[PDB]
């Protein structure tokens, strides 16, 4: 019972602590990077079509 309560307290402390914002910061970086790469590719295609 003591080990279970200690584990529950550790889980609650981890949930309350602001330290989970790692994925929601790492993944959007590469997501918007790929988005900007696609935008640059579309801009190059538009410039080629205009030429």
């Amino acid at each position: 019972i003591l080990l279970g309560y200690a584990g529950l307290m550790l889980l609650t402390n981890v949930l309350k602590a602001i330290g989970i914002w790692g994925s929601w910061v790492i993944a959007p970086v590469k997501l918007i990077f790929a988005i900007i790469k696609k935008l640059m590719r579309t801009v190059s295609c538009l410039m080629g079509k205009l030429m």
């Binding site: 959007p28 970086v29 918007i32 990077f33 988005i35």
Partner: peptide, 9 residues
């Protein structure tokens, strides 16, 4: 990396 993220987001 921080500057790239600031430019991207």
């Amino acid at each position: 990396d921080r500057g790239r993220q600031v430019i991207h987001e």
